[PDB]
Amino acid sequence: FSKACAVETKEGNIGFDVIALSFLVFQIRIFHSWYFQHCMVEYRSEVIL
Amino acid sequence: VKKLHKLANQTIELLWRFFEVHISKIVFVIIAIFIANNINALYIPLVILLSLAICLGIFSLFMCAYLFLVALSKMIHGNISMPEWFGLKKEVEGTEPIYMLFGVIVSIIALAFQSIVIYRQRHRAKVFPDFHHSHFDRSLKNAIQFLIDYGFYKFGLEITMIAIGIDIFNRMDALAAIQCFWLVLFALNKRVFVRRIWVFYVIYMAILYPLQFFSYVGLPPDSCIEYPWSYWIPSYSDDARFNLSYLLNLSIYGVNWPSAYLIGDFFVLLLASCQLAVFRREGEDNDSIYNDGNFVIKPENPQYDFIDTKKSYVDYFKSFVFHYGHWITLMSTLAAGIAGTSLFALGYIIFTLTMLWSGNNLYVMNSTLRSFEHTLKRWNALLGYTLFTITMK
Amino acid sequence: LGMIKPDQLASLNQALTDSYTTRDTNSILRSRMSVSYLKGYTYEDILI
């Protein structure tokens, strides 16, 4: 039965997802922090206007 | 000669200032490694008392005498007998009593290192007493001091979450399931919810640690009794029963529990203790700026502009981390999505493509119609989907 | 003494290529090496 369904070797890991979660939680924490209002001020009226 | 002597004096002073606050952590790590080396039965009282000490100079001498008792002891269905299961293996006579025990006697000196500073101090909690974070960007040395002094007050919640994630990664059991359920509960709420629930979480895990170690050590071999959890399964092979027991982390005869679990939960203990220690001295720095409830730019900020006046390199570092960090995190999430092979990978792909498709037009605070609030709603949806993915896996 | 019939060679190839377990990684390399070595000779270069 394991031969028939034939999972590749073992690939069900919980790896790179963890570091992706780390990066995105860091980003969302930065989104609610300082220097980011200045960042968006730089985005606004210097890129479009 | 004089300059070298002054540099040596500065180095020894700074390492002493490091030690006077890090000897406790260093000795705890050393003891954890040593008890991971020997996971026999007689290690229950010591892990219990270390857990109690972490939960709370009266406690400083509790383990000092017991390690001497261990040093006293180390000098003293079947297939194994009482002394070996206890943790006292009768080695070959005539070889050595100190054959591989070169750290316990050093550990006594380690306790002395923690005791000499205590005795000579009472006869402040900062290595750098002239620290100033007002203009931390005016010097790279000041930036390093910021990273080493307030580096945990700033992001302690994040590093504790990382520790929990790595524990789940190296744990992979029902304990990992409850840990990721706690992660889901924590990540989907504001600061007040964790403010209220962290004490319950830390006491629950502090109580769970001793029970985990009791499960690890197990039962005496010649007890003339069989574990009930070895005969729940009616009509499946014995290997299935072994897998079920291992996944639920229950004691079984002739088990060889690796030290990775103990290392992970010990680091969880230390991160929780540090988080609580900084959590007592709570302030207003680790609070969201959206508590006022509007998305408009705050008229006056307590920090100067960083995009201009690019001086030194720490300003460049802030610009890189605050201006293109979302590109890095989207790269990481796309790599994680493409690494896997499942419908969860497809969800990651579609979410990251629809996130990257809105480059800059959607990053505008122009009143309503998908403003900053909707951007944070989408990001919270990303958090929810990622936690759903990990818990489902 | 004679050249191996194609049926026997095909049966031997199938038996060699189905000799592994789905758990250990090193068995994959051994089976791959055996199949690759066998594939170097056609049915004309092998005799019985």
XYZ file of C-alpha atoms in Angstrom:
490
model
C 0.000 0.000 0.000
C 2.844 2.407 0.787
C 4.329 1.482 -2.590
C 1.030 2.251 -4.341
C 0.457 5.720 -2.868
C 4.225 6.374 -2.885
C 4.955 9.443 -0.816
C 8.223 10.801 -2.167
C 10.528 10.011 0.727
C 9.348 11.726 3.915
C 8.353 15.239 2.847
C 5.861 16.522 5.403
C 8.243 18.788 7.277
C 7.348 21.881 9.306
C 10.457 23.830 8.345
C 10.618 26.803 5.936
C 7.045 27.584 6.984
C 8.430 28.423 10.439
C 10.967 30.940 9.122
C 8.292 32.428 6.854
C 6.086 32.841 9.930
C 9.031 34.472 11.713
C 9.555 36.973 8.904
C 5.864 37.835 8.594
C 5.323 38.246 12.348
C 8.371 40.526 12.418
C 6.893 42.504 9.521
C 3.474 42.859 11.159
C 5.157 43.938 14.407
C 7.078 46.583 12.443
C 3.800 47.673 10.825
C 2.622 48.728 14.312
C 5.889 50.476 15.219
C 7.762 53.745 14.693
C 9.632 55.079 11.633
C 6.885 53.516 9.529
C 4.716 56.629 9.538
C 7.748 58.441 8.111
C 8.169 55.589 5.623
C 4.603 55.995 4.335
C 5.044 59.785 4.287
C 7.968 59.120 1.948
C 5.687 56.900 -0.148
C 2.967 59.571 -0.267
C 3.489 62.687 -2.456
C 7.051 61.759 -3.490
C 6.114 58.769 -5.670
C 2.733 59.843 -7.141
C 2.499 63.632 -6.748
C 52.284 47.960 26.820
C 50.176 50.473 28.740
C 47.535 50.546 25.997
C 47.416 46.741 25.919
C 47.076 46.636 29.713
C 44.240 49.177 29.583
C 42.484 47.155 26.872
C 42.870 43.988 28.957
C 41.441 45.771 32.004
C 38.479 47.017 29.964
C 37.847 43.523 28.583
C 37.983 41.869 32.008
C 35.683 44.535 33.468
C 33.136 44.112 30.671
C 33.212 40.315 30.928
C 32.757 40.580 34.707
C 29.756 42.848 34.110
C 28.405 40.253 31.676
C 28.953 37.488 34.235
C 27.328 39.271 37.191
C 24.031 38.964 35.285
C 24.585 35.886 33.065
C 26.156 33.345 35.458
C 22.685 32.173 36.499
C 21.687 31.473 32.891
C 25.054 29.872 32.082
C 24.911 27.518 35.068
C 21.273 26.661 34.314
C 22.221 25.765 30.731
C 25.169 23.682 31.959
C 22.978 21.809 34.453
C 20.352 21.210 31.761
C 22.997 19.781 29.422
C 24.345 17.545 32.193
C 20.886 16.226 33.093
C 20.242 15.660 29.393
C 23.384 13.510 29.378
C 21.989 11.405 32.257
C 18.195 11.068 32.212
C 17.878 8.344 34.851
C 15.340 8.209 37.678
C 17.144 10.050 40.493
C 17.073 13.389 38.574
C 13.463 14.165 39.574
C 14.148 16.295 42.704
C 16.727 18.441 40.922
C 14.532 19.199 37.907
C 11.648 19.928 40.297
C 13.724 22.392 42.316
C 15.153 24.073 39.199
C 11.601 24.473 37.877
C 10.531 25.989 41.204
C 13.524 28.353 41.175
C 12.749 29.481 37.617
C 9.116 30.011 38.625
C 10.324 32.259 41.463
C 19.178 33.828 48.107
C 17.248 31.092 49.890
C 16.832 29.186 46.609
C 20.492 29.635 45.606
C 21.715 26.993 48.091
C 19.044 24.371 47.339
C 20.867 22.853 44.357
C 24.340 23.536 45.786
C 23.996 20.777 48.388
C 22.100 18.361 46.128
C 24.842 18.368 43.488
C 27.214 17.444 46.311
C 24.752 14.662 47.144
C 24.858 13.657 43.472
C 28.656 13.755 43.672
C 28.334 11.651 46.825
C 26.022 9.270 44.952
C 28.206 9.098 41.826
C 31.166 8.037 43.976
C 29.131 5.208 45.539
C 9.997 -6.586 31.421
C 13.497 -7.235 32.733
C 16.999 -7.089 31.211
C 17.962 -4.513 33.875
C 18.080 -4.291 37.670
C 17.420 -1.728 40.396
C 20.825 0.060 40.611
C 21.031 0.636 36.852
C 17.461 1.935 36.620
C 18.113 4.216 39.602
C 21.095 5.782 37.838
C 23.902 4.067 39.757
C 25.674 1.716 37.348
C 28.378 -0.450 38.925
C 31.316 0.243 36.623
C 34.279 -2.087 36.187
C 36.241 -2.245 39.430
C 39.776 -0.873 39.363
C 39.383 1.506 36.409
C 38.207 4.837 37.881
C 35.436 6.514 39.903
C 35.938 9.820 38.043
C 36.373 8.200 34.632
C 33.931 10.448 32.725
C 32.797 12.777 35.544
C 34.765 15.959 34.905
C 31.957 18.512 35.174
C 30.128 17.860 38.444
C 33.179 18.917 40.449
C 33.468 21.865 38.050
C 29.755 22.523 38.609
C 30.538 22.955 42.314
C 33.029 25.651 41.302
C 30.313 27.059 39.032
C 28.053 27.358 42.079
C 30.967 29.060 43.838
C 31.180 31.532 40.947
C 27.498 32.355 41.453
C 28.102 32.572 45.220
C 31.257 34.713 45.375
C 29.542 37.600 43.575
C 26.528 37.349 45.900
C 28.667 37.287 49.054
C 30.899 40.204 48.023
C 28.093 42.450 46.722
C 25.757 42.752 49.724
C 28.673 42.718 52.194
C 22.220 48.443 38.552
C 20.918 45.598 36.349
C 22.763 46.866 33.286
C 26.240 46.229 31.896
C 26.454 49.770 30.517
C 25.394 52.328 33.166
C 25.655 55.349 30.826
C 23.325 53.971 28.151
C 21.163 56.424 26.192
C 18.612 55.442 23.540
C 17.615 58.994 22.558
C 20.219 59.169 19.757
C 21.154 55.511 19.282
C 21.664 56.164 15.549
C 24.544 58.617 16.106
C 27.069 55.816 16.723
C 27.462 52.180 15.714
C 28.706 51.425 19.234
C 25.529 53.006 20.605
C 23.536 50.829 18.194
C 25.312 47.740 19.551
C 24.520 48.906 23.087
C 20.868 49.284 22.073
C 20.883 45.759 20.629
C 22.458 44.298 23.790
C 20.571 46.320 26.446
C 17.012 46.903 25.180
C 17.232 44.178 22.528
C 14.944 41.970 24.611
C 12.706 44.672 26.092
C 11.990 45.642 22.482
C 11.255 42.169 21.032
C 10.871 39.598 23.787
C 7.455 38.440 22.638
C 8.874 37.792 19.166
C 11.843 35.755 20.409
C 9.571 33.746 22.721
C 7.334 33.024 19.726
C 10.418 31.916 17.774
C 11.403 29.615 20.641
C 7.898 28.120 20.658
C 8.071 27.644 16.891
C 11.429 25.877 17.021
C 10.107 23.729 19.882
C 7.190 22.723 17.650
C 9.622 22.059 14.792
C 11.824 19.787 16.924
C 8.929 18.350 18.979
C 6.333 16.915 16.539
C 3.830 15.338 18.926
C 0.649 16.108 20.856
C 2.724 18.457 23.012
C 3.553 20.265 19.775
C -0.192 20.296 19.057
C -1.050 22.021 22.334
C 1.922 24.370 21.864
C 0.706 25.425 18.416
C -2.837 25.797 19.758
C -1.408 28.180 22.362
C 0.469 29.919 19.536
C -2.788 30.322 17.591
C -4.522 31.739 20.668
C -1.667 34.175 21.343
C -1.066 35.407 17.783
C -4.722 36.361 17.120
C -5.194 38.973 19.861
C -3.960 42.336 21.114
C -1.498 43.059 23.926
C -4.117 43.033 26.702
C -5.091 39.415 25.990
C -1.521 38.137 26.316
C -1.141 40.490 29.302
C -3.951 38.547 30.982
C -3.187 35.017 29.739
C 0.623 34.791 29.969
C 0.571 34.048 33.709
C -1.838 31.148 33.168
C 0.232 29.839 30.254
C 3.518 30.012 32.167
C 2.099 28.336 35.271
C 0.510 25.606 33.123
C 3.790 24.851 31.355
C 5.774 25.081 34.612
C 3.459 22.462 36.125
C 3.656 20.380 32.935
C 7.473 20.222 32.906
C 7.805 17.945 35.990
C 5.062 15.638 34.687
C 6.899 15.507 31.360
C 10.069 14.440 33.157
C 8.172 11.806 35.173
C 6.855 10.430 31.885
C 10.410 10.458 30.522
C 11.977 8.554 33.426
C 9.166 5.992 33.527
C 8.599 3.133 35.976
C 10.900 0.635 37.723
C 11.407 -2.465 35.551
C 10.652 -5.183 38.119
C 7.351 -3.608 39.180
C 5.311 -6.694 38.149
C 2.858 -4.378 36.359
C 2.217 -3.449 32.730
C 1.340 -0.002 31.419
C -2.401 0.159 30.610
C -1.714 2.374 27.580
C 0.024 -0.644 26.021
C -3.270 -2.422 25.283
C -5.807 0.134 24.041
C -5.356 -0.954 20.410
C -7.649 -3.927 19.647
C -6.575 -5.170 16.220
C -3.381 -3.478 15.017
C 0.247 -4.550 15.169
C 2.651 -3.764 18.003
C 4.585 -1.173 15.982
C 1.374 0.851 15.678
C 1.044 0.727 19.470
C 4.651 1.891 19.840
C 4.022 4.761 17.418
C 0.880 5.760 19.328
C 2.766 5.707 22.637
C 5.660 7.730 21.202
C 3.370 10.341 19.633
C 1.510 10.865 22.922
C 4.841 10.859 24.830
C 4.119 8.133 27.379
C 6.653 5.981 29.200
C 7.492 2.563 27.757
C 9.957 -0.144 28.749
C 13.412 0.178 27.215
C 12.905 3.732 25.941
C 15.742 6.004 24.803
C 14.213 9.523 24.876
C 16.563 11.882 23.001
C 17.683 15.097 24.677
C 16.241 17.374 21.967
C 12.878 17.545 23.748
C 14.500 18.483 27.064
C 16.701 21.095 25.387
C 13.660 22.622 23.700
C 11.513 22.785 26.816
C 14.439 24.137 28.859
C 14.887 26.986 26.384
C 11.119 27.522 26.567
C 11.467 27.805 30.356
C 14.288 30.349 30.092
C 12.529 32.445 27.442
C 9.335 32.454 29.520
C 11.263 33.487 32.637
C 12.999 36.357 30.828
C 9.701 37.417 29.248
C 8.022 37.539 32.664
C 10.987 39.387 34.184
C 10.704 42.138 31.573
C 6.902 41.803 31.752
C 6.839 42.976 35.371
C 8.500 46.254 34.313
C 5.839 46.963 31.696
C 5.651 50.408 30.133
C 4.338 52.147 27.016
C 7.099 51.346 24.504
C 5.681 47.920 23.576
C 2.236 49.275 22.710
C 0.650 49.711 19.293
C 0.277 53.256 17.955
C -3.202 52.414 16.608
C -4.888 52.516 20.033
C -6.311 55.950 19.169
C -8.340 54.190 16.473
C -7.541 56.202 13.326
C -5.267 55.546 10.346
C -4.155 59.161 9.832
C -0.447 59.911 10.181
C 0.410 61.118 13.675
C 1.170 64.870 13.491
C 4.298 64.717 15.677
C 6.554 61.724 16.284
C 9.213 61.354 19.014
C 11.871 60.387 16.432
C 13.632 62.238 13.629
C 13.561 61.383 9.933
C 15.861 58.594 8.750
C 15.352 58.517 4.961
C 17.336 61.751 4.691
C 20.665 62.567 6.436
C 22.217 59.192 5.594
C 25.155 59.352 7.999
C 27.228 56.355 9.159
C 25.751 52.892 8.493
C 23.130 52.244 11.197
C 20.852 54.765 9.473
C 21.344 52.779 6.261
C 20.461 49.619 8.194
C 17.234 51.181 9.472
C 16.352 52.356 5.964
C 16.951 48.868 4.552
C 14.953 47.102 7.272
C 12.033 49.578 7.282
C 11.791 50.287 3.529
C 12.233 46.842 1.923
C 11.448 44.474 4.802
C 8.111 43.476 3.291
C 9.923 42.396 0.125
C 12.122 40.122 2.253
C 9.174 38.631 4.139
C 7.250 38.036 0.902
C 10.333 36.334 -0.546
C 10.532 34.117 2.539
C 6.843 33.192 2.429
C 7.025 32.441 -1.309
C 10.067 30.223 -0.726
C 8.202 28.414 2.055
C 5.196 27.944 -0.222
C 7.208 26.608 -3.154
C 9.223 24.308 -0.867
C 6.142 22.308 0.108
C 3.902 20.178 -2.108
C 0.232 20.315 -1.062
C -2.880 22.472 -1.278
C -1.374 24.609 1.494
C 1.426 25.425 -0.941
C -1.206 26.532 -3.467
C -2.789 28.753 -0.825
C 0.585 30.324 -0.068
C 1.175 30.891 -3.793
C -2.184 32.529 -4.450
C -2.037 34.697 -1.321
C 1.489 35.919 -2.041
C 0.663 36.689 -5.691
C -2.435 38.669 -4.719
C -0.363 40.422 -2.035
C 2.454 41.385 -4.420
C 0.003 42.469 -7.136
C -0.938 45.473 -4.956
C 2.424 47.221 -5.107
C 1.923 50.810 -3.946
C -1.599 51.977 -4.871
C -3.136 49.949 -2.038
C -0.606 51.372 0.466
C -2.482 54.691 0.718
C -4.303 56.074 3.772
C -6.839 58.062 1.722
C -9.842 57.728 4.075
C -11.794 54.546 3.160
C -12.015 51.889 0.417
C -9.222 49.500 1.418
C -7.100 51.792 3.599
C -4.475 51.012 6.270
C -7.123 49.186 8.316
C -7.878 46.875 5.385
C -4.149 46.314 4.855
C -3.787 45.170 8.464
C -6.912 43.037 8.053
C -5.275 41.300 5.082
C -2.067 40.798 7.064
C -4.059 39.339 9.969
C -5.703 37.015 7.444
C -2.199 35.940 6.409
C -1.392 35.211 10.069
C -4.610 33.231 10.409
C -3.916 31.168 7.298
C -0.326 30.436 8.347
C -1.398 29.297 11.817
C -4.185 27.223 10.260
C -1.611 25.604 7.965
C 0.792 24.720 10.776
C -1.944 23.425 13.093
C -3.487 21.373 10.271
C -0.104 19.846 9.435
C 25.886 -21.646 -23.930
C 23.784 -18.924 -25.509
C 22.669 -15.320 -25.497
C 20.067 -14.352 -22.912
C 16.516 -14.186 -24.224
C 14.845 -10.754 -23.954
C 12.153 -12.113 -21.619
C 14.720 -13.287 -19.060
C 16.577 -9.967 -19.217
C 13.327 -8.027 -18.773
C 12.333 -10.177 -15.791
C 15.769 -9.699 -14.215
C 15.555 -5.937 -14.777
C 12.108 -5.780 -13.166
C 13.250 -7.863 -10.188
C 16.325 -5.663 -9.720
C 14.364 -2.410 -10.025
C 11.762 -3.636 -7.504
C 13.987 -4.579 -4.571
C 13.812 -1.540 -2.257
C 11.955 -0.408 0.846
C 10.154 2.923 1.156
C 11.855 3.844 4.459
C 15.657 3.736 4.165
C 17.292 6.233 1.811
C 20.478 4.260 1.094
C 18.557 1.363 -0.485
C 17.442 3.759 -3.232
C 21.067 4.445 -4.166
C 21.938 0.736 -4.184
C 18.973 -0.139 -6.409
C 19.774 2.763 -8.744
C 23.412 1.680 -9.013
C 22.436 -1.935 -9.711
C 19.946 -0.933 -12.414
C 22.422 1.491 -14.004
C 25.153 -1.164 -14.062
C 22.799 -3.742 -15.585
C 21.592 -1.281 -18.240
C 25.143 -0.909 -19.582
C 24.925 -4.264 -21.388
C 22.251 -5.120 -23.942
C 20.805 -8.604 -24.406
C 23.529 -9.402 -26.967
C 26.466 -8.754 -24.602
C 25.133 -11.082 -21.864
C 25.395 -14.859 -22.163
C 24.245 -17.878 -20.163
